[PDB]
Write a protein that binds this ligand. Structure first.
Ligand SMILES: Cc1ccc(OCCN(C)C)cc1C(=O)N[C@H](C)c1cc(-c2cnn(C)c2)cc(-c2cnn(C(F)F)c2)c1
Ligand SMILES: [Cl-]
Ligand SMILES: [Cl-]
Ligand SMILES: [Cl-]
Ligand SMILES: [Zn+2]
Ligand SMILES: [Zn+2]
Ligand SMILES: [Zn+2]
Ligand SMILES: [Zn+2]
Ligand SMILES: [Zn+2]
Ligand SMILES: [Zn+2]
Length: 305
């Protein structure tokens, strides 16, 4: 048979029918199911298998595809895939969603959001699954998202936290946010953020109000945006009522329920406002509801006065 870790480079070996896979290879998975305890059925010859890296060439191949040396990563990924490959991934309004199952509401909103913003992932396994997800096959993408966030199937997830984990594995080096806070006592201090901190802010959902001025305490001073060089901006705030106006944003995440046990729903702005709840779709002209994250498009911004 064949054993690999990246599925790009394969290594051919043979198995004895009377010895279980673990003694010959180590922890071995097939199609997301652990075949370590299973003895070789001999029904499949030449089939590709996933093994935890043992050699040094395997360890190096594993990092070049995943960008991690954690030995637990492969196991956490294969156990997530075992669930995600039986989920349904319908296509709603030209976007790939997820039929609700095992509290994946936060995963679906993230998947729909990632298909609407410009992003490039540094780990090749993430980028390759990102492409496959856009086409309509996102089982490996959702499993990798769980493994990189160290989350499990059924576990309760927050969209803002999931996006920030994903942003740290993406090339946001070109992004830049220049801030300036002014206090009548301390004066004026100019700070310059870069990377994940340049595309995310917690406090308001309104990109305008962030450009206008938000009130943060000083050692209350006012914080306003001065320059933004990012393909997008994520505006996060604790869940509250908000009126989404058609054409003033890209997409938003709605959270309705109690802390940690509420349900996420996704709103996107097209020719009208659309609401995606897994496999369901809802259309309206304007939206008002509990909103916690709003995504805006951007290329370059420079403050005036
Ligand atoms: C679903 C889930 C899954 C996991 C999860 O983990 C959080 C813990 N992490 C550190 C691991 C959180 C959540 C979760 O409910 N998220 C939503 C958007 C939410 C809801 C509420 C809320 C308040 N009252 N009610 C009825 C709801 C408040 C906040 C909040 C406030 N401040 N902030 C920020 F300042 F931090 C965040 C966030
Ligand atoms: Cl890395
Ligand atoms: Cl990385
Ligand atoms: Cl926008
Ligand atoms: Zn090789
Ligand atoms: Zn990396
Ligand atoms: Zn399941
Ligand atoms: Zn399942
Ligand atoms: Zn849910
Ligand atoms: Zn001060």
């Amino acid at each position: 048979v064949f054993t690999t870790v990246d599925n790009i480079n394969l290594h051919t070996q043979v198995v004895d029918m009377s010895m279980t896979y673990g003694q010959q290879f180590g922890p071995t998975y097939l199609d997301g199911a652990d075949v370590t305890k299973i003895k070789p059925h001999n029904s499949h010859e030449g089939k590709t298998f996933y093994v935890l890296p043992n050699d040094d060439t395997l360890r190096v191949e594993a990092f070049e595809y995943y960008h991690t040396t954690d030995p637990s990563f492969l196991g956490r990924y294969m156990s997530a895939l075992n669930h995600t490959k039986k989920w349904k991934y319908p296509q709603v309004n030209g976007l790939t969603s997820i039929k609700w199952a095992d509290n994946n509401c936060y995963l679906a909103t993230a998947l729909l959001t990632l298909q609407q913003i410009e992003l490039k992932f540094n780990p090749p396994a993430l980028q390759d699954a990102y492409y496959r997800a856009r086409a309509g096959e996102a089982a490996n993408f959702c499993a990798l998202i769980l493994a990189y966030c160290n989350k499990t199937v059924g576990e309760l997830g927050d969209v803002r936290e999931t996006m920030s984990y994903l942003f740290q594995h993406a090339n946001l080096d070109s992004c830049k946010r220049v801030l300036n806070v002014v206090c009548k006592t301390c004066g004026q201090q100019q700070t310059t953020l870069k990377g994940v901190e340049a595309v995310m802010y917690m406090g308001t959902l309104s990109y305008e109000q962030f450009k206008k001025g938000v009130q943060i305490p000083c050692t209350q001073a006012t914080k306003y945006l001065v320059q933004q060089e990012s393909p997008f901006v994520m505006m996060s705030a604790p869940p509250a009522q908000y009126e989404l106006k058609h054409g003033t944003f890209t997409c938003a995440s709605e959270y309705t329920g109690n802390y940690q046990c509420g349900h996420y729903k996704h709103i996107t702005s097209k020719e009208t406002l659309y609401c995606i709840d897994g496999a369901l779709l809802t259309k309206s002209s304007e939206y008002k509801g509990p909103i916690t994250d709003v995504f805006y498009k951007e290329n370059s911004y420079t403050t005036t006065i």
